[PDB]
Amino acid sequence: TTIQVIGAGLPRTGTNSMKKALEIIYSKPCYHMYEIIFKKQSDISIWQQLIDETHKTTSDKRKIYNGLNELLNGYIATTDLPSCSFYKELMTMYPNAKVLLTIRDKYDWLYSLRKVVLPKSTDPWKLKIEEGDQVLGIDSNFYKMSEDSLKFAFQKNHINLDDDEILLECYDEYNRLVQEIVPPERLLIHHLGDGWESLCQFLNVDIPNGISYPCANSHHQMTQLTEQLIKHKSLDDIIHMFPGLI
Ligand SMILES: Nc1ncnc2c1ncn2[C@@H]1O[C@H](COP(=O)(O)O)[C@@H](OP(=O)(O)O)[C@H]1O
């Protein structure tokens, strides 16, 4: 197995649904942050080391390529942070892999990002996220890797992540740069709600008969998950309330 599809879209742009859609198309696993959080938390330190490598005056690109290849062994595709920030490196490693850019209205994205991925440092909800994440064993090292991977996608070192205006413009700039870098024939821009048709044509497959395009990972569902993790202090005791998600 080798990487066939590189998902360059940012978190909260429908990447979990695209993960599920690609697993339906190929019948093989697709990487996502959920893989890190719920299956392979040991990958957190590996990703951190690759992000740190990019900060060096002279980064070891072959160390990065091998780290990515090792991380993605057994996967047919990748989506979401932190992998999306490495889409250029992945394009080089997998010259035959096609690129997806999942995209959505920027104001809806920012709202979703603030409720799940990157709340403001003064937002009381941040403490609820953290208490719920402790049930999952997620600690401060995860937040550092996640934040660092987002800054790396935005190609900025010193950035005020609490400024909505700055995030909105980083969002647009990131999406614009993907379209500039990736050749058109190699890129599909998939807007939220687009469904199977464009995706399956791009990938040279038929539309899955009788199987609807996935619709998963809403911020309402993540808020409910946080509150149930805090209330019951166990993922196993609550997993039945979130069918088909993890
Ligand atoms: N088929 C679909 N149609 C419309 N929205 C979808 C969708 N699949 C996922 N989404 C939305 O995409 C966001 C999750 O993306 P990701 O998996 O990258 O984190 C959620 O937005 P909201 O948080 O606004 O509900 C989710 O509702």
Ligand SMILES: CC(C)NC[C@@H]1CCc2cc(CO)c([N+](=O)[O-])cc2N1
């Ligand atoms: C339940 C909650 C309290 N924590 C678990 C959630 C699971 C979804 C999720 C997705 C991303 C990016 O897809 C990030 N991220 O980039 O940090 C964090 C989280 N966290």
